[PDB]
UniProtKB/Swiss-Prot annotation:
Organism: Homo sapiens
Protein's name according to its UniProt entry: Eosinophil granule major basic protein
Subcellular location(s) per record: Cytoplasmic vesicle, Secretory vesicle
Intrachain disulfide bonds: 18-113, 90-105
Domain C-type lectin: 1-115
Length: 115
């Protein structure tokens, strides 16, 4: 069960909002079926992307890709073209096509909470 929050917020703000207002977490995606259903739900928004629960953590050369809801990173649907290196440590889903893109965490966007 997931829901869309139209309010524009930074990654950290959204993280908080999903937990306190809905007793959930920024959504995590584990298969094409769900990624597509989420895609359809936001296909009309005016913004080009929405925050989902993904984050790239770590320092140095060895890092990791995590979901704020603790589940495992076993699926991804990355956009073929996008600034990658230095492109950001937070993950967003595109309203068009449903592609995932790296984005700067302090940017304000709509987001998906699960519960």
């Amino acid at each position: 069960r997931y829901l869309l929050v139209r309010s524009l917020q930074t990654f950290s703000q959204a993280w908080f909002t999903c937990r306190r207002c809905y007793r959930g977490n920024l959504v995590s995606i584990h298969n094409f079926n769900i990624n597509y259903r989420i895609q359809c739900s936001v296909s009309a928004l005016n913004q080009g992307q929405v925050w989902i629960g993904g984050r790239i953590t770590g320092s140095g050369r060895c890092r990791r890709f995590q979901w704020v809801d603790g589940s495992r990173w076993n699926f991804a649907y990355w956009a073929a073209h996008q600034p990658w290196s230095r492109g950001g440590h937070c993950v967003a889903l595109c309203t068009r096509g449903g592609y995932w893109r790296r984005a700067h965490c302090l940017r304000r966007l709509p987001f998906i909470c699960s519960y």
